[PDB]
Symmetry: C2
Subunit: 93 residues, 2 copies
């Protein structure tokens, strides 16, 4: 059960890109795996996965000029499943 990242703010570096700045929530139940950012116009919406969870900002590339956007974020905790049976298979010539 991951809480949302607090204190969100975006600012456009160029007409075709906007960087997004966020902060860590204080007490979190367990570690998080990644962040998920989404872009919408929004009169379908695109999802962009931020790989490194230890990150406080990222730059959204590939946007349209002179267009307004709305952004949202969420923390993600992936639960690893049990390992399956081990199998062996060698590669030959």
């Amino acid at each position: 059960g991951p809480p949302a990242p607090r204190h969100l703010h975006a600012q456009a570096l160029s007409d075709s890109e906007i960087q997004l700045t966020w902060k860590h929530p204080e007490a979190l139940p367990g570690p998080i795996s990644k962040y998920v950012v989404e872009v919408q116009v929004a009169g379908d919406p695109l999802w962009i996965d931020v790989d490194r969870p230890e990150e406080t900002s990222t730059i959204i590339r590939g946007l349209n000029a002179s267009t307004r956007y709305l952004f949202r974020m969420r923390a993600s905790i992936q639960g690893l499943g049990d390992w399956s049976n081990t199998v062996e298979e060698s590669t030959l010539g």
Copy 2:
């Protein structure tokens, strides 16, 4: 997430190795992806979870390879405050 049962392996010739597995029964909710480990370690997960087989690339010939898999579930937390920003 329960482990994917009945795992199987079968290589091509001298490059790629293909794996095959049966889905696990009785699982609480969906799963996000299947993670696969390859020791000559390196984890290489399959993006699409509704899958029964995948191709393992990058393998030197004449080498004893072994595989193991596991399921995963991305616990997507709550969304953050919505924010607006203009471009020009």
